[PDB]
Amino acid sequence: EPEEPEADQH
Amino acid sequence: PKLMVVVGGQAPKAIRSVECYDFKEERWHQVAELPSRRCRAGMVYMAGLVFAVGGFNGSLRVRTVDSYDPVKDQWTSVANMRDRRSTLGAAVLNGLLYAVGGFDGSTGLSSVEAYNIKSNEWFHVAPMNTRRSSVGVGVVGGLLYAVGGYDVASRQCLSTVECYNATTNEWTYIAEMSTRRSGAGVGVLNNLLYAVGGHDGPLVRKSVEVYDPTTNAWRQVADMNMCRRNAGVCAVNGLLYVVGGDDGSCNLASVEYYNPTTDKWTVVSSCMSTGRSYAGVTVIDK
Known part of the structure; x- marks a missing residue:
């Protein structure tokens, strides 16, 4: 899964 | 005599480092490292202990405490x-x-849970009105406030704020902030709730605003010296300290403090061992 915080996922 | 404790964070990946700032010595110190790498964790001082709550280990979101x-x-x-x-x-x-x-790795959460140290048990309480990841919280006047954050349902960074009453077990919206702030630092100083920085998409804020529960109104104070999202915030000896964070591109090693009598932000001369964002910050007795 994406390592970025949710606000930063695109 | 207080110590500021900074726990974990990204620098640029999740770390174990725990640093303490001694205000009298005016020096940073490394103390016992976290057992496991963590960033994006909650951090509180309770019953003489520092609690590190949840977070991210660089791979998975966790339920550890x-x-x-x-x-x-x-x-x-x-x-x-x-x-x-x-x-x-x-x-x-x-x-x-x-x-x-x-955020649980899937979606942002409106759920809330509480920990009873006497029984070492967690239990859910009433959920918030809105899902909020990258949410800041503060307690003032016997109420808990959830400030801004990110709502995946609307894909929006949030300007709304809600307050939890533990007697009625209910979350209620309060006055809206002047702007959207995901990843705002939150602190309480002299019966005012501070919302510090944050971001709206790639737009990282240096602005800061304050909330007075007695008037249910927000107003802006002086801008920080730099834009910061995901900074740690604490109040010490009449000042509000803002620790690290990032400007959307780089992690910050600097700390700056706000003096509400002069309405000025001052960068602390001594920085942390490295720039770190998403670090837990609290204050303990020395």
């Missing part, structure tokens, strides 16, 4: 939360530790 005994300089595991929570806010209210919102 550990407590730090500053006298013994030792970390100990406490009961896991019900839910994985990363970029949550954590606060103490009426002797209970609340884990508010966050």
Whole structure:
């Protein structure tokens, strides 16, 4: 899964 | 005599480092490291211990909780939360530790759970009105506030704020902030609730605003010296300290403090061992 915080996922 | 404690964070990946700032010596120190790498965790001081709550280990979002005994300089595991929570806010209210919102690896959370240290148990309480990941929290006047954050349902960074009443077990919207702030630092100083920085998409804020519960109104104060999202915030000796964070591109090693009598932000001369964002920050007795 994406390592970025949710606000930063695109 | 206080110490500021900074726990974990990204520098640029999740780290174990725990640093303490001694205000009298005016120096930073490394103390016992976290048992496991963590960033995006909640952090509180309760019952003489520092609680590190949830977070992200660089791979997975976690439901782990550990407590730090500053006298013994030792970390100990406490009961896991019900839910994985990363970029949550954590606060103490009426002797209970609340884990508010966050992200479980799938979606942002409106759920909230509370920890009873007497029984070492977590239990859900009423959920928030809105899902909020990267949410900041603060307690003032016997109420818990959840400030801004990110709502995946609308794909929006949030200007709304809600307040939790533990007597009625209800979340209620309060006055809206002047702007959207995901990843705002939140602190309480002289009966004012501070919302510090944050971002709206790639637009990282240096602005800061304050909320007065007695008037249910927000107003802006002086801008910080730099834009910061995901900074740690604490109040010490009449000042509001803002620790690290990032400007959307780089992690910050600097700390700056706000003096509400002069309405000025001052950068602290001594920085942390490295730039770190998403670090837990609290204050303990020395």
